[PDB]
Amino acid sequence: PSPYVEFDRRQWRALRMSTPLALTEEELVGLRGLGEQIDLLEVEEVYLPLARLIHLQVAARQRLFAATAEFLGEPQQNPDRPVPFIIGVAGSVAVGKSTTARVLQALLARWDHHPRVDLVTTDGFLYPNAELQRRNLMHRKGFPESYNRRALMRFVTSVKSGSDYACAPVYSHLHYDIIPGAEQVVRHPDILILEGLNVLQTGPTLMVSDLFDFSLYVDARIEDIEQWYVSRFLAMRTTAFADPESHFHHYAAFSDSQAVVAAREIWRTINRPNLVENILPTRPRATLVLRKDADHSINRLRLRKL
Amino acid sequence: PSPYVEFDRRQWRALRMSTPLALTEEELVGLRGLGEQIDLLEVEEVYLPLARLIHLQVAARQRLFAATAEFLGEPQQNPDRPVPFIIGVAGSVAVGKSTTARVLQALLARWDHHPRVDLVTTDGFLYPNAELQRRNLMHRKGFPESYNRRALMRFVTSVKSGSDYACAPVYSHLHYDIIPGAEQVVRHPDILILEGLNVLQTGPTLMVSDLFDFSLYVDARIEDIEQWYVSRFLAMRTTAFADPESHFHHYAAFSDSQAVVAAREIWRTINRPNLVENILPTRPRATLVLRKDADHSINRLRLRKL
Numbered sequence A, B: 001p002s003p004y005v006e007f008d009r010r011q012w013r014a015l016r017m018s019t020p021l022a023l024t025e026e027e028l029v030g031l032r033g034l035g036e037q038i039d040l041l042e043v044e045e046v047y048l049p050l051a052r053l054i055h056l057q058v059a060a061r062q063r064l065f066a067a068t069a070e071f072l073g074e075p076q077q078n079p080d081r082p083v084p085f086i087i088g089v090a091g092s093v094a095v096g097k098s099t100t101a102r103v104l105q106a107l108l109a110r111w112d113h114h115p116r117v118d119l120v121t122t123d124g125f126l127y128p129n130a131e132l133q134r135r136n137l138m139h140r141k142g143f144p145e146s147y148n149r150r151a152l153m154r155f156v157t158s159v160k161s162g163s164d165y166a167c168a169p170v171y172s173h174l175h176y177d178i179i180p181g182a183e184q185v186v187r188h189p190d191i192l193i194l195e196g197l198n199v200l201q202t203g204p205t206l207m208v209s210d211l212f213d214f215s216l217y218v219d220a221r222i223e224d225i226e227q228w229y230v231s232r233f234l235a236m237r238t239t240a241f242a243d244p245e246s247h248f249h250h251y252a253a254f255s256d257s258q259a260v261v262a263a264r265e266i267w268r269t270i271n272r273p274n275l276v277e278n279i280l281p282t283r284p285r286a287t288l289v290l291r292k293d294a295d296h297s298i299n300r301l302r303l304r305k306l
Ligand SMILES: N#Cc1ccc(-c2ccc(OCC(=O)O)cc2CN2CCN(c3ccccn3)CC2)cc1
Pocket: A093, A123, A138, A139, A140, A141, A142, A197, A232, A233, A248, A266, A270, A271
């Protein structure tokens, strides 16, 4: 006996679930352009059933807010509306957290109950490169210490406080660094999805995940993720690395053969270690685990028993 | 702003409650049954509203369980009832956790939604004294390493998994040790309260607090708790120390001045620093912080915004 219900892909299909609520095919157009390669059978069969499920919990939280407010007899100090409902998404680099997030943000916003869904990445809570160097941390971008954990805690606290706005820094993926003076403003949305490698990580402190209301871990075999990371690296020669402005411009010129070697090395020495030591252990802390096959389709869902 | 709504004693009392919540006959009589001078006015005016508030959360989760199972068209692999709803109670030694937990267990059981409330203390997961000496830990009883954290985790997991039964060892407070062979057997209660020093503690592992649905931290000025620790020691000359079988019998004969010195020293060297290092830092992880006045009465409630 486990604290999770487990459904393989066959079983999850083989239900028997409530709504049509099916997708408008004007919305399926908007859904294609959240690149990389968005499978639409994935959305219909997995992410929409998932979104409905999460809506159940967001709705339950909303009613419970109201029932409690009513029991307390709407006192001054009680807030007027439920505080944002925060979802965490965790997983290895290159597992597709970002895609998973953008898809859930688009689906969950379809309900009248909670139409304002914000998405923030913890990438903005990285120390700037300058500070990273200063701490011997350039080879460890994405490990726990490479984030300003205090600032990140302040951000989420403030959001969960129900404050009017909350500012986050913005990480530029092209420049591989924080953007000086850039800020993402967050104004008490109904849901906030928080995406990052570190969002389910433990701490002697209070940690951000104490402020979640739901969390996903996006899981895959480690071999499989390596393969995605390599294919991604080679593809970046055309785009990120192509700009002569990039610090990683010199990778643009590597042949396929040599780029594979370079990818696999960066994998082995930064991300794979980060995954095993720090990311994988936070997996059993997620409300829902999604295991993806080698070709990106979800082959197993684990869901905490309610 | 803050993620807690805050009421003090007056505000909480003076509130327009949406029910005539009065305790019955019969209710007060059975509550005198725990009545190590339990203040029944506090029980009616503070604990009962609090119990009602926790009830709302239990009933919301119970219905979510139902909405969710209905949505998945109740699959064979889905459980047939909500798993137990688990409540942590933490705080300093001699802060009154155990009283607070027993009172809550009595008040929560009165709803038909969940008449079966169990109570377990993490005291039962301490290593036996013989294992403690073996580890140079006799002087750190109640520090985190003094518990079999693995067995404790297995216990809470098993209950949150929905097992028919789960066992926990049993601690004799008068003999200061585990009772060999004793077991407390928990059988899918509707609600399980888990009381202890360490219940809200962090670990790199999946920790027990990951399995709670709600948690209490019982708070007080550190000075006050010392005063109560000292008084309780003096009072113990008459109860626990009075037995000449006891390992601490010799304390029964110490007079007020010496007993104060002895008590104050034990506090300064074991309990106080356990509180500062390991217990105080978990306080912000709780859903509800109850803070008691020098005279044991609750004077502030901080509740997490919904
Ligand atoms: N020293 C050193 C030193 C030198 C070079 C690199 C390096 C070069 C090219 C890369 O292109 C492939 C890609 O970008 O996938 C990737 C990396 C390493 N990654 C940087 C982004 N990191 C994170 C992690 C979390 C959030 C944002 N960013 C995770 C690790 C790394 C370290």
